Amino acid sequence: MENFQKVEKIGEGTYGVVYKARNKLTGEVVALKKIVPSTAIREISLLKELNHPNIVKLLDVIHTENKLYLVFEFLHQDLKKFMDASALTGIPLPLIKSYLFQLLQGLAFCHSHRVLHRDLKPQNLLINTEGAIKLADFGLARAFVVTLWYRAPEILLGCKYYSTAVDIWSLGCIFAEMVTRRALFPGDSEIDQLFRIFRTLGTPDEVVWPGVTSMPDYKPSFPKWARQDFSKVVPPLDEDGRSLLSQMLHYDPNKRISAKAALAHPFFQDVTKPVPHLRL
Ligand SMILES: NS(=O)(=O)c1ccc(NC(=O)c2n[nH]c3ccccc23)cc1
């Protein structure tokens, strides 16, 4: 590991501290994450082959002194900071739509390889100066302070075998947040998270989500809220954007739109790739 000089700490992630670091041989600047079960080693090693331009590149996996360091390509800014910096005027819709489109490409890729993220959130969506956005920490949750805001309702209801659909749900919540400049469901506990979802989208029932009532953490005592209309939930998003968001936020994970079908949605008919103006 001595092959790296830490330049600065970027922050505490779910799986360890992330450092900006410089390779002493190569000269390259990278993100260095200090995270050992052989099972974790093999899953992580699979992730090195999972290469896509909207997926932060895992450069190296350093198992040393019984410790695990992951070396990634480095990006200069995350979507949370960019959202914060954009909050006076909001992110312009064409850049929201570009970001959403690119992230759906990323998902479509990983999902087609049966790999899910499970913990999408603004802090692991990384952006560069060329107008790209990338998913960071893909596949780590499986290979191995906690924000709940982007958690799919089937996870909160105790489903142990959830699907790629959970990422679509997270990404729908992020889409909404870019548009409105506020978190869609900022729960501060699991029940607060669930009940915020219920209050906006309606308490789910057997009609809209067959099997919901048989889920591990479902309680017949849940209060029954009525669904709100999306026009009230994410103005001033147009009809195509609301329609797509609605399909990303379907309760039933089987009805929820796939990343691949989302890419064909009419919302993306006029998609472009703007460059943001970023201050590094
Ligand atoms: N807070 S901030 O906007 O200044 C900022 C946020 C994030 C990164 N960059 C990173 O954290 C980062 N780059 N590549 C990664 C690969 C995996 C995990 C994190 C990775 C830099 C700056």
Q: Which keywords apply here?
A:
three-stranded antiparallel beta sheet; Phosphorylase Kinase, domain 1; five-stranded antiparallel beta sheet; Transferase(Phosphotransferase), domain 1; 10 helices; nucleotide-binding; cyclin-dependent protein serine/threonine kinase activity; binds N-(4-sulfamoylphenyl)-1H-indazole-3-carboxamide; protein domain specific binding
Overview of this structure, please?
It is built from 10 helices and 8 strands. By secondary structure, the protein is α+β, with helices and mostly antiparallel strands. The protein has 2 domains: 76 residues, Phosphorylase Kinase, domain 1, CATH 3.30.200.20; 202 residues, Transferase(Phosphotransferase) domain 1 (Transferase(Phosphotransferase), domain 1, Orthogonal Bundle). A 5-stranded antiparallel β-sheet has the order 1-2-3-5-4, with helices on one face. α3 runs antiparallel to α6. The radius of gyration is 19 Å and the shape is globular. The two termini are 28 Å apart. The relative contact order is 0.13. The protein binds N-(4-sulfamoylphenyl)-1H-indazole-3-carboxamide. N-(4-sulfamoylphenyl)-1H-indazole-3-carboxamide binds next to β3, β5 and β6. N-(4-sulfamoylphenyl)-1H-indazole-3-carboxamide (LZ3) binds next to β3, β5 and β6.
Quick summary:
It comes from Homo sapiens. The protein is of the alpha+beta class and 280 residues long.
